[PDB]
C-alpha cells in the first residue's frame, strides 16, 4: 500500500513539474530573441557611428595619432 | 486527495505566471526600441558635430596637434 501512495504522488508531482518547466521554456526562449535583438541592434549604431567618423578623419591620417 | 489540490493550485499558479510574464514581455521590448532609439539618435549628433569641426581644422592639420 505504501507503494500505491508513492505512485499517486509521483504521478501528481511529475504532471506539475512537466507542465511547469515546459511553459517556462517558452518564456526562456522569448528572453533570448529579445536579448539577441538588442546585441545586434546596438552593434549597428556602434559600427555605423564608427564608420562615419572613421572616414571623416580618413584611413590615411588615423595612422598618425599614436606614433 | 492531496494530489487533487496540488493540481488545482498548480493550474491556478501557472495561469497567473503565464499571464503576468507574457504581458511583462511586451513592456520589456518597448523599453528596448526606446533604448535603441536613444543610442542611435545621440550617435548622430556626436558624428555630425565631429564631422563639421573635423573639416574646419581640416584633415591635413589635425595630424599636427600631437607630435
Curated annotation (Swiss-Prot), chains A, B:
Which domain of life does the protein's organism represent? Eukaryota
Compartments where found = Cytoplasm; Nucleus, Nuclear pore complex; Cytoplasm, Perinuclear region
* Tissue and organ distribution: Present in most normal tissues. Higher expression observed in epithelial cells with secretory and excretory functions, as well as in cells chronically exposed to xenobiotics, such as bronchial cells and cells lining the intestine. Overexpressed in many multidrug-resistant cancer cells.
Which Cys pairs does UniProt list as disulfide-bonded? none
* Membrane-traversing stretches: none
Q: How is it modified after translation?
A: Phosphorylated on Tyr residues after EGF stimulation. Dephosphorylated by PTPN11.
Q: What induces it?
A: Up-regulated by IFNG/IFN-gamma.
Q: How does it assemble?
A: The vault ribonucleoprotein particle is a huge (400 A x 670 A) cage structure of 12.9 MDa. It consists of a dimer of half-vaults, with each half-vault comprising 39 identical major vault protein (MVP) chains, PARP4 and one or more vault RNAs (vRNAs). Interacts with TEP1. Interacts with PTEN and activated MAPK1. The phosphorylated protein interacts with the SH2 domains of PTPN11 and SRC. Interacts with APEX1. May interact with ZNF540.
Role: Required for normal vault structure. Vaults are multi-subunit structures that may act as scaffolds for proteins involved in signal transduction. Vaults may also play a role in nucleo-cytoplasmic transport. Down-regulates IFNG-mediated STAT1 signaling and subsequent activation of JAK. Down-regulates SRC activity and signaling through MAP kinases.
The text the record gives for the protein's domains is:
MVP 3 mediates interaction with PTEN. MVP 4 mediates interaction with PARP4.
Q: What is this protein called?
A: Major vault protein
Instruction: Tell me which species this is from.
Output: Homo sapiens
Q: Which gene encodes it?
A: MVP
Q: Which residues of the full protein are shown?
A: 746 to 812 of 893
